[PDB]
Amino acid sequence: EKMVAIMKTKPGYGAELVEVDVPKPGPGEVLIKVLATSICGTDLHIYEWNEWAQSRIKPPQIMGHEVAGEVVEIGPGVEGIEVGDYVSVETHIVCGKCYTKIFGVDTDGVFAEYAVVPAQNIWKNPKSIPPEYATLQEPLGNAVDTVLAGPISGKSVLITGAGPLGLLGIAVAKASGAYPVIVSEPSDFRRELAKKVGADYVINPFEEDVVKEVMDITDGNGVDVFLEFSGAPKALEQGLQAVTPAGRVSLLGLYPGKVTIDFNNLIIFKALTIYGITGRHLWETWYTVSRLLQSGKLNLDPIITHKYKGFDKYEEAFELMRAGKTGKVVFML
Amino acid sequence: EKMVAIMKTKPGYGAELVEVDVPKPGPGEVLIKVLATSICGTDLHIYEWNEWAQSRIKPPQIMGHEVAGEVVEIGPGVEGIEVGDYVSVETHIVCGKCYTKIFGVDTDGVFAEYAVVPAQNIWKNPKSIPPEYATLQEPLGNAVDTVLAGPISGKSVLITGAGPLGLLGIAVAKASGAYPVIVSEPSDFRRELAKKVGADYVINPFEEDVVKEVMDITDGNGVDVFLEFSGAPKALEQGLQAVTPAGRVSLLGLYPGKVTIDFNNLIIFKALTIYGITGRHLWETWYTVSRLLQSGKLNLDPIITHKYKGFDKYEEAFELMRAGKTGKVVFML
Amino acid sequence: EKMVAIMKTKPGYGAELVEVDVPKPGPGEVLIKVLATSICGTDLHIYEWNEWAQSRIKPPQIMGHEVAGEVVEIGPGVEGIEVGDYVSVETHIVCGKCYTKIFGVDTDGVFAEYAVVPAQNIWKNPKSIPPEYATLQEPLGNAVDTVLAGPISGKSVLITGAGPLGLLGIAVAKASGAYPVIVSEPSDFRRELAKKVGADYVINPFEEDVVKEVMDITDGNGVDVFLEFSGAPKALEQGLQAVTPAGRVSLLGLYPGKVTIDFNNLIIFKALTIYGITGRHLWETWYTVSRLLQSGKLNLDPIITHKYKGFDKYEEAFELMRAGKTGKVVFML
Amino acid sequence: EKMVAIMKTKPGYGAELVEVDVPKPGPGEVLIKVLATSICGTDLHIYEWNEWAQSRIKPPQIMGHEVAGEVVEIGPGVEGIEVGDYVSVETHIVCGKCYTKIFGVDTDGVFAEYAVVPAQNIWKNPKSIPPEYATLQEPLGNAVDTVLAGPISGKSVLITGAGPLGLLGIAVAKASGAYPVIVSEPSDFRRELAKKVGADYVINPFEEDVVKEVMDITDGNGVDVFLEFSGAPKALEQGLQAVTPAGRVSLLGLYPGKVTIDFNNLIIFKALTIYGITGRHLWETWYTVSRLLQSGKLNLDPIITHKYKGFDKYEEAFELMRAGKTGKVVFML
Ligand SMILES: NC(=O)c1ccc[n+]([C@@H]2O[C@H](COP(=O)([O-])OP(=O)(O)OC[C@H]3O[C@@H](n4cnc5c(N)ncnc54)[C@H](O)[C@@H]3O)[C@@H](O)[C@H]2O)c1
Ligand SMILES: NC(=O)c1ccc[n+]([C@@H]2O[C@H](COP(=O)([O-])OP(=O)(O)OC[C@H]3O[C@@H](n4cnc5c(N)ncnc54)[C@H](O)[C@@H]3O)[C@@H](O)[C@H]2O)c1
Ligand SMILES: NC(=O)c1ccc[n+]([C@@H]2O[C@H](COP(=O)([O-])OP(=O)(O)OC[C@H]3O[C@@H](n4cnc5c(N)ncnc54)[C@H](O)[C@@H]3O)[C@@H](O)[C@H]2O)c1
Ligand SMILES: NC(=O)c1ccc[n+]([C@@H]2O[C@H](COP(=O)([O-])OP(=O)(O)OC[C@H]3O[C@@H](n4cnc5c(N)ncnc54)[C@H](O)[C@@H]3O)[C@@H](O)[C@H]2O)c1
Ligand SMILES: [Zn+2]
Ligand SMILES: [Zn+2]
Ligand SMILES: [Zn+2]
Ligand SMILES: [Zn+2]
Ligand SMILES: [Zn+2]
Ligand SMILES: [Zn+2]
Ligand SMILES: [Zn+2]
Ligand SMILES: [Zn+2]
Ligand SMILES: [Zn+2]
Ligand SMILES: [Zn+2]
Ligand SMILES: [Zn+2]
Ligand SMILES: [Zn+2]
Ligand SMILES: [Zn+2]
Ligand SMILES: [Zn+2]
Ligand SMILES: [Zn+2]
Ligand SMILES: [Zn+2]
Ligand SMILES: [Zn+2]
Ligand SMILES: [Zn+2]
Ligand SMILES: [Zn+2]
Ligand SMILES: [Zn+2]
Numbered sequence A, B, C, D: 001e002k003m004v005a006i007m008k009t010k011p012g013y014g015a016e017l018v019e020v021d022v023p024k025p026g027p028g029e030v031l032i033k034v035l036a037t038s039i040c041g042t043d044l045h046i047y048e049w050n051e052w053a054q055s056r057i058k059p060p061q062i063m064g065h066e067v068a069g070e071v072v073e074i075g076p077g078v079e080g081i082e083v084g085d086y087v088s089v090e091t092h093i094v095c096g097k098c099y100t101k102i103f104g105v106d107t108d109g110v111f112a113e114y115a116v117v118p119a120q121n122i123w124k125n126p127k128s129i130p131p132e133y134a135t136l137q138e139p140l141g142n143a144v145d146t147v148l149a150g151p152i153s154g155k156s157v158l159i160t161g162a163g164p165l166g167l168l169g170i171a172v173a174k175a176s177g178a179y180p181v182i183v184s185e186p187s188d189f190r191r192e193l194a195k196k197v198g199a200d201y202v203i204n205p206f207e208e209d210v211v212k213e214v215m216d217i218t219d220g221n222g223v224d225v226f227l228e229f230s231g232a233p234k235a236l237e238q239g240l241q242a243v244t245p246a247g248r249v250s251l252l253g254l255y256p257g258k259v260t261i262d263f264n265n266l267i268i269f270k271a272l273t274i275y276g277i278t279g280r281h282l283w284e285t286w287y288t289v290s291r292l293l294q295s296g297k298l299n300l301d302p303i304i305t306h307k308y309k310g311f312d313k314y315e316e317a318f319e320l321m322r323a324g325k326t327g328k329v330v331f332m333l
Helices: A041-048 A137-147 A164-175 A188-197 A210-217 A233-242 A263-268 A283-295 A314-322 B041-048 B137-147 B164-175 B188-197 B210-217 B233-242 B263-268 B283-295 B314-322 C041-048 C137-147 C164-175 C188-197 C210-217 C233-242 C263-268 C283-295 C314-322 D041-048 D137-147 D164-175 D188-197 D210-217 D233-242 D263-268 D283-295 D314-322
Strands: A002-008 A016-021 A029-038 A066-074 A086-089 A114-118 A122-124 A157-160 A181-184 A201-203 A223-228 A243-251 A259-261 A273-276 A304-309 A328-332 B002-008 B016-021 B029-038 B066-074 B086-089 B114-118 B122-124 B157-160 B181-184 B201-203 B223-228 B243-251 B259-261 B273-276 B304-309 B328-332 C002-008 C016-021 C029-038 C066-074 C086-089 C114-118 C122-124 C157-160 C181-184 C201-203 C223-228 C243-251 C259-261 C273-276 C304-309 C328-332 D002-008 D016-021 D029-038 D066-074 D086-089 D114-118 D122-124 D157-160 D181-184 D201-203 D223-228 D243-251 D259-261 D273-276 D304-309 D328-332
Touching: A041 A314, A066 A114, A066 A137, A086 A137, A122 A283, A137 A164, A137 A283, A157 A164, A157 A233, A164 A181, A164 A188, A164 A223, A164 A283, A181 A188, A181 A210, A188 A201, A201 A210, A210 A233, A223 A233, A233 A243, A233 A259, A233 A263, A243 D263, A259 A263, A263 D243, A263 D273, A273 D263, A304 A314, A314 A328, B041 B314, B066 B114, B066 B137, B086 B137, B122 B283, B137 B164, B137 B283, B157 B164, B157 B233, B164 B181, B164 B188, B164 B223, B164 B283, B181 B188, B181 B210, B188 B201, B201 B210, B210 B233, B223 B233, B233 B243, B233 B259, B233 B263, B243 C263, B259 B263, B263 C243, B263 C273, B273 C263, B304 B314, B314 B328, C041 C314, C066 C114, C066 C137, C086 C137, C122 C283, C137 C164, C137 C283, C157 C164, C157 C233, C164 C181, C164 C188, C164 C223, C164 C283, C181 C188, C181 C210, C188 C201, C201 C210, C210 C233, C223 C233, C233 C243, C233 C259, C233 C263, C259 C263, C304 C314, C314 C328, D041 D314, D066 D114, D066 D137, D086 D137, D122 D283, D137 D164, D137 D283, D157 D164, D157 D233, D164 D181, D164 D188, D164 D223, D164 D283, D181 D188, D181 D210, D188 D201, D201 D210, D210 D233, D223 D233, D233 D243, D233 D259, D233 D263, D259 D263, D304 D314, D314 D328
Parallel strands: A157 A181, A157 A223, A181 A201, A223 A243, A243 A273, A304 A328, B157 B181, B157 B223, B181 B201, B223 B243, B243 B273, B304 B328, C157 C181, C157 C223, C181 C201, C223 C243, C243 C273, C304 C328, D157 D181, D157 D223, D181 D201, D223 D243, D243 D273, D304 D328
Antiparallel strands: A002 A016, A029 A066, A029 A114, A029 A328, A066 A086, A086 A122, A259 D259, A273 D273, B002 B016, B029 B066, B029 B114, B029 B328, B066 B086, B086 B122, B259 C259, B273 C273, C002 C016, C029 C066, C029 C114, C029 C328, C066 C086, C086 C122, D002 D016, D029 D066, D029 D114, D029 D328, D066 D086, D086 D122
């Protein structure tokens, strides 16, 4: 039995759409049939084959890691998982000995009709959640950990960056009672998506003064919460200036390099609480994500800008991403 | 200049609708013109004149404490407040020396066309918030402190009691991303109001087994959060049984007397976190309430079951309350 | 090769000192040579063979669970543990699937010269910690989770109950900067031990009014923290009355049955934070315990009232415990 | 009646020891007789008259702000304070309207035999606390807010900087159960003081590799808590590298200017919690400080390196400070 897969055949740009054997689940593994799979920034780096990918990816290897699938076969030893289960996957494979590898980065991914998954990284989904939303749970998890690092209901918020993560952040913040949610994004396309998801105010940082606008919106008090989703040094500076004294900051975005910041006046004298964010990858975050999805309060439709039937148009998909003309791209099978 | 007022003229049942002089604001006080004022359980006790009222109320005295008004005159010394300001009032008058008196309980209230208010208890409202909603801010504050005593977004919740406070609790929980929100209320009328506000599931405790139903809804895990809004001993027992181990409980409801509870198995062995709730009455809670109101996410319309024009039908209003046929009653001026 | 062991041979009172084969470690297990082992309340119940033991203990079975030992042999599969390692044991054997069995309760214990231990429940000890202190880590863990459930440095504290757990609680609280630490204990012997460990004030509840004394010590403010280590209904009532409004309570002690408490005035109106405590049994607590032991700040010497060489005098040990004439009893090998 | 005072007579270096009228307390003020007063970094800047002082100090003005005194006269309106009360002073005079001025910076200080103090900034001291320790409460408050920003008992700690604040930090951390407490300080004199206060390990950053040493002490895990008390850019970098992933950081030290930091790897990928610290100046911190002082657990003797009788040798005192040959200097009256 053969299957179609988007694979990084060798070092270099792009990828190849090929047909390989349907993998067989070994001890502690299960086989899932892919229903939907979405593309992430990490996948784009592997595609473009940058410095990062050039040092960690070992081709040939199937790409992708975000998925919504159905278990079709369970390997030896597996317990608690049955054929027919609707599932998604946690990408971080931890060892549990730390004081490890990433699914779809150090192993074959889910951009194929079927995929092998370690049983321990399986998350069961309620049948009511559509595949196109279920596949966004890993990214949603990062957004949830960023937004909910502290209290947010009835709090004013400044979100810098409206890429897919920032958009998911807006959706989580609004569903969590945040108001007003202010979003700064230079891209016209993404700034408009932010508005559609639910941003109460949007700011174009290349045409307006972010801090001034925030001060106007918050009557000079600043925002209670600043969430950094862009990775732009300037945005970090602006948010630290815009956050109210004793406010909370969550940093998810990754910068080009080191950043030069006025710690004395913006962090120390303002007595801020700053949380560095990276994926929890523990079930607690997944429980929160699942419930928010089941609640119907997450306005995700505007975020899914592209839905492809099959993997055939993969090249077009990756190109649209590089051109910054996408929110979230999903492959439907 | 005279004004109409609902006043507790003397000890006994009921109250009198009279006309008295429009009060004049003294040092540290301001005069507000009432736009809307709502009735609370405390007001009903003063009306019925029970043991509690019989020991603290000193008639004659104007009733009521929940209000939305406009400042028409500022007394001597007052700073930061100007004529024309749209405001609401914090009822607890604290001393700031503790490690005191209640507005509308130990002083004249707001069930009149005008009312004198200590400047320090004034809260300025954004002009966008309608009077009928602004007057519910004190009760909303109790609901916010109960619901938001801990994390709630993407958490399952059991609310026992759907009286006005429980209804406001449901509205706050839903706006805060809680799901599913399960409400137990024996009253058919109020149980239906709960559904209209936004309860995901409702339970009639006199016809169903609360714990069983919760277990069914949560697949045997129990709820992450239990909020007690009824004051019924049985409900407290049920919630403690229904809450997941290591879950959180917020207790607002007041019981008839002491309660007998299995601490060993329900609290200690389940490692619960229990918060006793009573009104914050500090600005932080008011900031949260104001933002949630401005967000438009609080489904308050179903809670306001009665809107009276003027105070003339006050007797009918209080009677409907005793008959348990109301959510929140508001007087519009 | 044979070894001496204190074993519950059959249903009934007492136990037998016998000689059995030195167990052999199977897959995922290791064999430790016991250096020191201490007696706990649970062991006494198994000895006395009460209702609880009569329903869970399946004789014949080696008693005891608190230990400090040295690994002498590692079973198949075991990684991270080498022969010669100085270790202690976590008693709760969890499954990791919950939203299980207890070492020394549902399995052979450590009251023997050698004992088999699941590798996953092994905790490595720094060689600087003496065996007689290392064996008290499980009980210390319960005390740490109770005392440190919230902030405690520079906080006033009321501890009810000075049994071994309460004594360990006093030691942890003092090492953590608590002051003053007030201890209520009716037993003259244990009340004196409390003073020796480091209690700043002691109260004899059968001769004095606990709440009055606390109020005198705290100038009418009450204590910031109330830790219940007795399991006595009256003590729970007194602590809830003695704790300052908005204070914190940690409940570890287990009551005879249900308790009748004034929730309205003592918990709700005082806006308390109540934590039900039961053993963490996760590494975080063990890390805290280990560091506190290494710090030399825990005054444990007064708590170890009896040190026996070998198991021969086991009957005398258990009897002294029932007579309430002990703090902590340790068997040295 | 005249009194001696250390006063900044005019712009420029140094100060003058003069005799002026004993001030009289006006409305809301009280007069205290100084028993002990200590010198702070702020006082040294006013003495040296740097850019900061050159822009905020308005001479003539009495210097100093840290004090332990006795109330000798109460002004009009004052309540709750009686002649004979042993007190200390909170330096931050807040307005309570914020979403202001500093005692001893924008007003006459306490380096005189008597001083006028706003009643609201008075803190009553237990008579058991010696004047030389009571006068260190404001600085201790900064140290407490830094150390206790999060949990610390049984946690490993790295403190960078052993100036007076860092020394007080070490004393608070040890009294709070921290272990091991690692201190990095280039000054031989201060590094030795750190050891005397109670540091478990000391590091000379100009002769050793701080991170390497921390890794050796913590077996490659890093410290649970990093407290920055130096204000040195390099120290901030080292602590962020030395703190364990998901650890906590408290920043009190103020840097020369902006700092360039690797946010991606040290804060974001390590999921740190960072607290910017500046003085609480609210009673809660004062309550904690007072109890820790009453506990006798703070090893403050080594920190007080100089005790002067009277103000006569003020010039010598300030010079010793600039030469970095002091811990804390106290004037005894
Ligand atoms: N810490 C973690 O664990 C983690 C995990 C995943 C992704 N990330 C990071 O989160 C960030 C967002 O990732 P993404 O997938 O949405 O990528 P993205 O490429 O879509 O970038 C986010 C957005 O920032 C916008 N932006 C650029 N300069 C800006 C400025 N000055 N102000 C406001 N917005 C500005 C861009 O136009 C873009 O739309 C990245 O830095 C990514 O590397 C972090
Ligand atoms: N702690 C505080 O600071 C504070 C402040 C205000 C009000 N309260 C209390 O909050 C509670 C609710 O007040 P409210 O104004 O909404 O009053 P309410 O009279 O409307 O009572 C709440 C609801 O509980 C329902 N109920 C009765 N038995 C029940 C059961 N077994 N299970 C579920 N529901 C049951 C009643 O039918 C009613 O609709 C009261 O106990 C009130 O005294 C507490
Ligand atoms: N929740 C958990 O996970 C857990 C785990 C272990 C032990 N425990 C419980 O912790 C408690 C203490 O256990 P222990 O081993 O120290 O037992 P213990 O028998 O030594 O009892 C504690 C002390 O309470 C004292 N006491 C009795 N009445 C009192 C009163 N009115 N006021 C003050 N003190 C009073 C007794 O004299 C005794 O010294 C028990 O209830 C035990 O069952 C709970
Ligand atoms: N944020 C606030 O509210 C606040 C309030 C008061 C003081 N402070 C600041 O706290 C800090 C400490 O003040 P202080 O009075 O103890 O002053 P201090 O002059 O005594 O300086 C602290 C110590 O840092 C040491 N140091 C210098 N470079 C170092 C390095 N690379 N590694 C380790 N130690 C190094 C110095 O030798 C000195 O002993 C300062 O930056 C001060 O301005 C902050
Ligand atoms: Zn992804
Ligand atoms: Zn704009
Ligand atoms: Zn434009
Ligand atoms: Zn990741
Ligand atoms: Zn994940
Ligand atoms: Zn009310
Ligand atoms: Zn039903
Ligand atoms: Zn029915
Ligand atoms: Zn109230
Ligand atoms: Zn209030
Ligand atoms: Zn034990
Ligand atoms: Zn006594
Ligand atoms: Zn006696
Ligand atoms: Zn246990
Ligand atoms: Zn344990
Ligand atoms: Zn100072
Ligand atoms: Zn060294
Ligand atoms: Zn040297
Ligand atoms: Zn200051
Ligand atoms: Zn202060």
